[model samples]
Structures are given as C-alpha cells and as structure tokens.
Target: VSQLFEEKAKAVNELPTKPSTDELLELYALYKQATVGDNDKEKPGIFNMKDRYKWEAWENLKGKSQEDAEKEYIALVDQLIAKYSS
Candidate 1:
C-alpha cells in the first residue's frame, strides 16, 4: 500500500511536483501503521480511536439491557458515518 501511494504520488508529481514519492510513501506507511497496529499500549498506531474513553461510554450504554439505548446507538453511529462521509 505504501508503495502504491508512492507511485501515485510520483504520478501526480509529474504535473507540478507537489508531494514527492518519498513523502507519500512515508505518509502511507504511517497511516497503515496507525490503523493496523494494536494500540493497547498507547503506541503510534492510527487504529486507535481518537477517544477510547468516549467509545467505551457508547459501548457501555449501547450494550446494556435497555433497548432504546441500543437503538439510539445504532442511529447515532449511522448519523456519524453520514456526517463524516459528507
């Protein structure tokens, strides 16, 4: 994936030479590591959510026996995804 990013960067660079292939590769590697690595130890992975505590709160509320909480949780996630996608 990093190599692919580098190639893409190089291709784009052909126009005006904005981001170098090396920079694109480095950024891609970092992004992959951040999202793919286990973050149990507060390492430099992007897989770790911005706020684990907030996620914990949502999980707790959503997983409880209350049905409305679960429903609301699902709705909330859908809303969030839509917002982010936009």
Candidate 2:
C-alpha cells in the first residue's frame, strides 16, 4: 500500500505544471495524513500564511484513516495528471 502511494507520489512530482494553491493544500493534507497519521504539531505562526494553510488542511483530515488518505492521495494525483498532462 505504502509502496503504491510512493510511486503515485513520484508521478505527481512529475506533473507538467505547478498545481493550484487549493490542489497543493489538498495534496499536503493527504500526504501528511497518509504518512504521519494526523496533524499533531502546532500550527505555524500567523505570519506564515502558507504553513498555516497547510496546517489547516491537514487538520481537516484529522480523523481520516491512513489507508483512506493514501487512496485519496492517489485519486487526487490521477485527477491532477489527467487535467495537466499532455
């Protein structure tokens, strides 16, 4: 399961264009949830809007299972590929 997720992640990294902010946040949340279980650390400082957004995104998936996260991450990567790939 993890291996498959890793492969999908590599494919995501190969995407032709940078994803939108919302999509990046979605990926960040799913990746953290899949690999780290849940958001457990402090949110970034107020000045760091970027990290704050990432923190919030991960927090939104607080109760999602790791397996579910992995599945969602793969689905998201596929969606992004189909949208951006040549």
Candidate 3:
C-alpha cells in the first residue's frame, strides 16, 4: 500500500551507505514514477547530462501505474537496504 511506500521512502534516507550511481538512477526514476505517475515535462537541455538522465529514467516508465511503481520502489528499496544499510 501507499503507506508501505511512504515508509520505504523514508527508510532510504536512513541508509548508512550510498547506493551506486546506477542504483540511484533506478531509485529516482521509480520514486518519481510512483509519486508523479509520469514525466510530462520536456527533456532537459542537450548539454545537461544529469537532468537528461533523470528525465529519461522517469520517461521510460510512461505507461506504468503509480501503484505498480510503488511496489517496484518498495522492493528496490528493500534490496538496497540489504546492500547499503547492513
């Protein structure tokens, strides 16, 4: 449920170690997809690789429902916790 997702969202902040960049990208995209549903804004400027990567990450989940995203996010956060929070 959304409550679980919210809890996991908070748990992410408690992680003792930082996730790798690729894991972070996936987490960001899942979090955005879970909360925002989809990315409606245009892509970032061509030279802004950072924003562009974020935009594309969220955009790739265009058709996924927020509920599904929540599950995916919760699961991912759990996995990350095992690796980073242990």
Candidate 4:
C-alpha cells in the first residue's frame, strides 16, 4: 500500500508540499467518520458530538458556501486517496 501511494504521489507535482501530521490526523478522523462513524447513531457515531454546544456551532455552517468548506473537504479526500492508492 505504501509503495502505491509513493507512485501516485510522484505522478502529481508536489505543489502542496503534502499536509502536516496534524492535518493528516484530522483527515484520518474524517475518513473513519465517513467509513465507520455511523452517523445514524446519536451517540456511538464518530461525528456524534459529545458537546452539544460545539455541534450546534458546527451546524451553523451547514449552508455556508462550498468555497468556504471546500478546502477541508478536498483535503480529506486527498489524504484518503493517497492512503488508499497506496
């Protein structure tokens, strides 16, 4: 898996300098959330907010412009694709 990741990464220009560990970590969290977070579970789901306040704050951005959210959304996909391509 790692070898495949290297190959694909090589194919792409290293324009973004790759992401930092912190960013990668967040990506990991999001990936798990999408694949196993089980959004349907009010409690057990990964995205399930333990802090209602924080969740409510996040909800505020639900209809925000995609341009504002695209950075985060794209980064997560990029990380996953890199890992999975590997």
Candidate 5:
C-alpha cells in the first residue's frame, strides 16, 4: 500500500495543470500526515497565510493514522490524475 502511495505521488508530479489552492492544501495536509504523523511545530505567523493554512490543514488531521493518510493521499492523487491527465 505504501508503494502504491509512492506511485501516486509520482503521478501527482505529472499533472498537466496546477491544482487549486484547496486541492493543494488537501494534498499538503495528507502528505504531511502520512509522512510526519501529526503537526508538532509552532503555527506560522499571521503574515504567513499560506503556511498558516497548511498548518491548520495538517493539525486538523492530528489523530489520523499514517496508513489512513497514505490511502487518502493516493486516492486524491488518482482523482486529480483522472481529472487532468491528457
């Protein structure tokens, strides 16, 4: 399953168009949760809106299991590939 996740991640890099901010946020959150488990760093300053959002997204998945996060990340990447692949 982890190997599948890696393949999907590679697929993400092949996307023909950039994903939306929300989509990127979801990907960021899932990737962090999958790789790092949970958010442990201090929240970014208010002026760093992008990192702040990314922090919020990762923090929101605080209790999720890494296996679950990997599954979700792969699913999302597959969805994006289907939506945007040539």
Candidate 6:
C-alpha cells in the first residue's frame, strides 16, 4: 500500500489537468494525514484561507489511520485520473 500510494502521489503530477483548488486542499490534507498522523500544527492566525481549510480537512479525518488515509488518497487519485485521461 505504501508503494502504491507513492506511485499515485507521483502520478497526480502527470494528470491531464489539475484538480480544483478546493480539491487540491483536500488532497493536500490527505497527503499529510497519510504521511503524518493527523493535523498537529497550529492553525494560521491571519489565515491564508488555504491553510485554514487544509487544517480543517486534516483535522476532520483526525481518527483515520495512516493506511486508511493512504487508501482514500489513492482512490481519489484514481477517480481524478479516470476523469481527465483523454
């Protein structure tokens, strides 16, 4: 699963197009949650908006296991790839 997750992580860069800005945030959260345990960093005070949302996204999955996050990230990547593969 770790190897597969790494493959998909790289594959995202080769996607025909980028995911939406919001989707990227979700992906960002998923990537961190999978690699790290959960959101432990402090929330931004001024709030980049992006950072605020990502913080919530990761925190929302607070109890998700790392392997579970990896699987979800891979699944989402698969959907994105399928949608854009011309």
The candidate that wins on lDDT is 3
Better of 1 and 3 by TM-score: 3
For 28-78, candidate 4 gives per-residue lDDT tens digits of 333323323233223334655443433333333434422333345454456
RMSD (Cα, Å) for all candidates, in order, is 14.4, 2.3, 2.2, 10.3, 2.3, 2.5
- Per-residue lDDT tens digits for candidate 3, residues 19-48, read 678888887777777766766667588788
lDDT of 5 by residue, 1-86 (tens): 66776777666655667666678888777776766776667668879989898888788878764767887777798888787677
In TM-score terms, candidate 6 sits at: 0.72
Model 2 agreement with the true structure over 38-70: per-residue lDDT tens digits: 667776887998999888878887876477787
The C-alpha stretches of model 5 lying farther than 4 A from their native spots are none
Q: After superposition, how far is residue 42 of candidate 3 from its true place, in Å?
A: 3.2
Off by over 4 Å in 1: 1-52, 55-69
**By the lDDT metric, which is better: model 1 or model 2?**
2
The C-alpha lDDT values of all candidates are 0.35, 0.75, 0.76, 0.40, 0.74, 0.72
Model 6 poorest ten-residue lDDT run: 38-47
Candidate 5 — number of clashing residue pairs? Answer: 0
lDDT of 1 by residue, 1-86 (tens): 23433333233334343334434343233323323322223343366553444334333333232343323333333333343332
Worst lDDT 10-window in candidate 2 = 9-18
TM-scores of all predicted structures: 0.23, 0.74, 0.76, 0.28, 0.74, 0.72
- In terms of lDDT, which candidate is stronger, 3 or 5? 3
Scored by Cα lDDT, where does model 6 land?
0.72
| Number of colliding residue pairs in model 3 | 0
* C-alpha lDDT of residue 47 in model 3: 89
Query: Can you list the residue pairs that collide in candidate 5?
Result: none
Q: Who wins the TM-score comparison?
A: 3
- Model 1's alpha-carbon lDDT is 0.35
